[PDB]
């Protein structure tokens with residue numbers, strides 16, 4: 001499937017470093033998700049019943065993430081193979097080829113649940129649960145779908161690639177706007193400690209989620225002839241994605257659990 005990983009792998013190839021590093025950073029990804037899974041399971045008892053749906057959604061996200069990131073990892077290593085002559089790893093015809101599908105599926109599943117789960121920890125004031133939920137779920141699904149559409153043109157048609165990226169961005173923008181409202185309403189009438197944690201959650205959410213569109217554009221951030229437009233851009237992209245995954249899923253989940261506990265007090 002015509003993507004950048006495959007482009008680079010089929011033309012320049014990947015240095016030992018780029019291929020080993022990338023492989024290791026992916027393994028950390030799914031490793032951390034597994035640890036996260038066990039954490040959210042074990043600690044579920046630490047929060048009042050009325051918050052436990054958040055912990056549950058954390059656990060489920062962990063399952064999803066671990067399975068698909070693990071599959072992704074195996075895909076990476078399988079797709080590229082070493083050539084003694086040039087001393088680099090090249091896209092392997094006997095392999096399945098690298099597939100972004102695993103990640104974009106993970107997003108499709110995880111995005112709704114991550115947005116949903118905060119609604120079980122914080123209380124809204126003037127907004128309706130059902131309104132916020134539907135707005136999250138819709139825009140979350142649209143954002144990933146348009147992104148996925150765009151990813152097809154990454155190499156083929158960099159114009160459409162960006163256009164769909166921008167449409168995706170629009171939906172992203174809508175999500176941020178709703179989450180801002182949720183968090184602000186969540187703060188009213190809770191302890192300053194809780195407000196502290198909600199402030200932190202916002203920042204983590206804002207940064208961690210923005211990493212994704214960053215890694216999506218990563219290869220072209222230096223132009224077509226740029227440094228990033230290479231195995232290094234693949235390296236960077238996958239690193240950032242992995243940093244975003246851990247942040248947006250595990251750390252996000254941890255913080256919500258901590259918020260829940262202060263609200264039990």
Ligand SMILES: *C/C=C(C)/C=C/C=C(C)/C=C/C1=C(C)CCCC1(C)C
Nearest residue numbers: 107110147168169172212213216248
């Ligand atoms: C746990 C996985 C998460 C939270 C994935 C989130 C993914 C995004 C917020 C993706 C955003 C994108 C854009 C805003 C434009 C470019 C295409 C995407 C999908 C990377």
